[PDB]
Design an enzyme around this catalytic site. Sequence first.
Site, PDB file in Angstrom:
ATOM      1  CG  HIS A 162      -7.863  -3.623  -2.559  1.00 40.15           C
ATOM      2  ND1 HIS A 162      -8.647  -2.652  -3.101  1.00 40.15           N
ATOM      3  CD2 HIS A 162      -6.807  -2.966  -2.064  1.00 40.15           C
ATOM      4  CE1 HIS A 162      -8.115  -1.467  -2.829  1.00 40.15           C
ATOM      5  NE2 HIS A 162      -6.985  -1.622  -2.207  1.00 40.15           N
TER       6      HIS A 162
ATOM      7  NE  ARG B 197      -3.835   2.486   2.199  1.00 42.95           N
ATOM      8  CZ  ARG B 197      -3.757   3.221   3.342  1.00 42.95           C
ATOM      9  NH1 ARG B 197      -3.140   2.929   4.511  1.00 42.95           N
ATOM     10  NH2 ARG B 197      -4.445   4.356   3.254  1.00 42.95           N
TER      11      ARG B 197
ATOM     12  CD1 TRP C 264      -8.082  -6.906   1.570  1.00 41.70           C
ATOM     13  CD2 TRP C 264      -9.782  -5.663   0.869  1.00 41.70           C
ATOM     14  NE1 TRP C 264      -7.690  -5.589   1.583  1.00 41.70           N
ATOM     15  CE2 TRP C 264      -8.703  -4.804   1.189  1.00 41.70           C
ATOM     16  CE3 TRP C 264     -10.958  -5.130   0.337  1.00 41.70           C
ATOM     17  CZ2 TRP C 264      -8.758  -3.431   1.024  1.00 41.70           C
ATOM     18  CZ3 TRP C 264     -11.041  -3.754   0.209  1.00 41.70           C
ATOM     19  CH2 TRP C 264      -9.952  -2.930   0.560  1.00 41.70           C
TER      20      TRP C 264
ATOM     21  CG  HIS D 290      -1.142   5.409  -0.742  1.00 42.76           C
ATOM     22  ND1 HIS D 290      -1.907   6.233   0.066  1.00 42.76           N
ATOM     23  CD2 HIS D 290      -1.999   4.508  -1.265  1.00 42.76           C
ATOM     24  CE1 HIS D 290      -3.147   5.777   0.100  1.00 42.76           C
ATOM     25  NE2 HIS D 290      -3.239   4.732  -0.703  1.00 42.76           N
TER      26      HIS D 290
HETATM   27  C1  HEM Z   1      -9.277   2.778  -6.818  1.00 43.65           C
HETATM   28  C2  HEM Z   1      -8.081   2.566  -6.299  1.00 43.65           C
HETATM   29  C3  HEM Z   1      -7.939   2.174  -4.827  1.00 43.65           C
HETATM   30  C4  HEM Z   1      -8.651   2.601  -3.804  1.00 43.65           C
HETATM   31  C5  HEM Z   1      -9.853   3.550  -3.822  1.00 43.65           C
HETATM   32  C6  HEM Z   1      -8.095   1.982  -2.608  1.00 43.65           C
HETATM   33  C7  HEM Z   1      -8.596   2.191  -1.350  1.00 43.65           C
HETATM   34  C8  HEM Z   1      -8.099   1.519  -0.281  1.00 43.65           C
HETATM   35  C9  HEM Z   1      -8.567   1.737   1.077  1.00 43.65           C
HETATM   36  C10 HEM Z   1      -9.638   2.794   1.415  1.00 43.65           C
HETATM   37  C11 HEM Z   1      -7.871   0.914   1.874  1.00 43.65           C
HETATM   38  C12 HEM Z   1      -7.944   0.690   3.389  1.00 43.65           C
HETATM   39  C13 HEM Z   1      -6.943   1.289   4.317  1.00 43.65           C
HETATM   40  C14 HEM Z   1      -7.162   1.207   5.798  1.00 43.65           C
HETATM   41  O1  HEM Z   1      -8.294   1.492   6.248  1.00 43.65           O
HETATM   42  O2  HEM Z   1      -6.094   0.907   6.412  1.00 43.65           O
HETATM   43  C15 HEM Z   1      -6.993   0.125   1.018  1.00 43.65           C
HETATM   44  C16 HEM Z   1      -6.146  -0.829   1.480  1.00 43.65           C
HETATM   45  C17 HEM Z   1      -5.178  -1.416   0.724  1.00 43.65           C
HETATM   46  N1  HEM Z   1      -4.862  -1.069  -0.584  1.00 43.65           N
HETATM   47 FE1  HEM Z   1      -5.949   0.052  -1.809  1.00 43.65          FE
HETATM   48  N2  HEM Z   1      -7.022   1.188  -2.949  1.00 43.65           N
HETATM   49  C18 HEM Z   1      -6.915   1.295  -4.313  1.00 43.65           C
HETATM   50  C19 HEM Z   1      -5.938   0.700  -5.072  1.00 43.65           C
HETATM   51  C20 HEM Z   1      -4.883  -0.042  -4.636  1.00 43.65           C
HETATM   52  C21 HEM Z   1      -3.738  -0.467  -5.389  1.00 43.65           C
HETATM   53  C22 HEM Z   1      -3.425  -0.127  -6.843  1.00 43.65           C
HETATM   54  C23 HEM Z   1      -2.993  -1.177  -4.547  1.00 43.65           C
HETATM   55  C24 HEM Z   1      -1.618  -1.861  -4.808  1.00 43.65           C
HETATM   56  C25 HEM Z   1      -1.557  -2.499  -5.986  1.00 43.65           C
HETATM   57  C26 HEM Z   1      -3.670  -1.242  -3.281  1.00 43.65           C
HETATM   58  C27 HEM Z   1      -3.227  -1.914  -2.172  1.00 43.65           C
HETATM   59  C28 HEM Z   1      -3.835  -1.936  -0.949  1.00 43.65           C
HETATM   60  C29 HEM Z   1      -3.527  -2.840   0.139  1.00 43.65           C
HETATM   61  C30 HEM Z   1      -2.474  -3.943   0.089  1.00 43.65           C
HETATM   62  C31 HEM Z   1      -4.304  -2.485   1.159  1.00 43.65           C
HETATM   63  C32 HEM Z   1      -4.378  -3.118   2.581  1.00 43.65           C
HETATM   64  C33 HEM Z   1      -3.494  -2.442   3.598  1.00 43.65           C
HETATM   65  C34 HEM Z   1      -3.459  -2.865   4.995  1.00 43.65           C
HETATM   66  O3  HEM Z   1      -3.896  -3.974   5.300  1.00 43.65           O
HETATM   67  O4  HEM Z   1      -2.932  -2.013   5.765  1.00 43.65           O
HETATM   68  N3  HEM Z   1      -4.861  -0.547  -3.341  1.00 43.65           N
HETATM   69  N4  HEM Z   1      -7.141   0.522  -0.292  1.00 43.65           N
END
Ligand code: HEM
Length: 293
Positions: A174, A47, A190, A51
């Site tokens: 995700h 993540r 997820w 970012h």
């Molecule tokens: C439309 C695009 C995306 C949106 C709106 C989005 C939104 C989010 C949100 C809101 C979270 C939760 C964070 C939390 O509450 O800690 C999340 C988690 C995460 N996102 Fe995305 N994300 C997007 C794309 C991506 C991409 C491109 C990646 C990497 C390829 C990614 C990887 C992750 C991962 C691994 C987590 C989990 C993190 C954790 O467990 O701390 N996401 N995402």
Amino acid sequence: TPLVHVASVEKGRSYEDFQKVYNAIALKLREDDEYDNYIGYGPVLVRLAWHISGTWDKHDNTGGSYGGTYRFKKEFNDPSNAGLQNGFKFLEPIHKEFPWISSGDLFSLGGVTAVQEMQGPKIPWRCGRVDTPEDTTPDNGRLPDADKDAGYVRTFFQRLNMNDREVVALMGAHALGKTHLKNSGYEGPWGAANNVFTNEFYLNLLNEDWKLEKNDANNEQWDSKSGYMMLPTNYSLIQDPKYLSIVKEYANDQDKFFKDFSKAFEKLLENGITFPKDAPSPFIFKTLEEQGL
Ligand code: HEM
């Protein structure tokens, strides 16, 4: 006109120097296993790599991974970056150990490392990001919202030069980690294998019985009976015909998914960087396991 960010290898470092950073991250991943209820730091690192990269704007070449600008308060305190401070602290001690690596290189390697150590595909990686000054830090508001539809998604990713295939592949990340109410206003995992890299995301999208519900932060999320969640932007992938065909394929073939992901992830991490012809070819790091460590 548009900035030009040319890669510049950390003076006198080779492949072996980078493999040592990798191993350091990898070994700390193995050891700090209790984080977030035993999920580990894998997911947050991925993540974080996304970012720092996701701020890129193909129109004027600002943002992206080059600069390691997340080190600056403005980018660090971005509400969209809430929770990333945990991946940041994880990496500090490593940085202190290998102070010659640039910030952009470190934050990006953390992600490759995480993916590979979580049994994902190998992601070729290139060194050469160079720390830029506080004033090259992009304004907040370049990272995407979670409460939109497929149209929003398509348009947004276009700014990063990503096509449909790349978008659906990247979105498969995700499968890792979870949402946290306090960070994003969303809550829940997820799927089931939250620290192993698989095509779970696509399967869960296709196979679960999703119900729209409002959460404790008054945000809408798709909830399943197995106890999983999907953000609206996640869900929108089955609402679009083009996206959906790609979801199916990945649901059906994890190999394909892993290939597409790999490419898309490297691209993401390299957006905005110019690599001179004398620049070393992309590195493919060995896992701990491949090294017997
Ligand atoms: C439309 C695009 C995306 C949106 C709106 C989005 C939104 C989010 C949100 C809101 C979270 C939760 C964070 C939390 O509450 O800690 C999340 C988690 C995460 N996102 Fe995305 N994300 C997007 C794309 C991506 C991409 C491109 C990646 C990497 C390829 C990614 C990887 C992750 C991962 C691994 C987590 C989990 C993190 C954790 O467990 O701390 N996401 N995402």
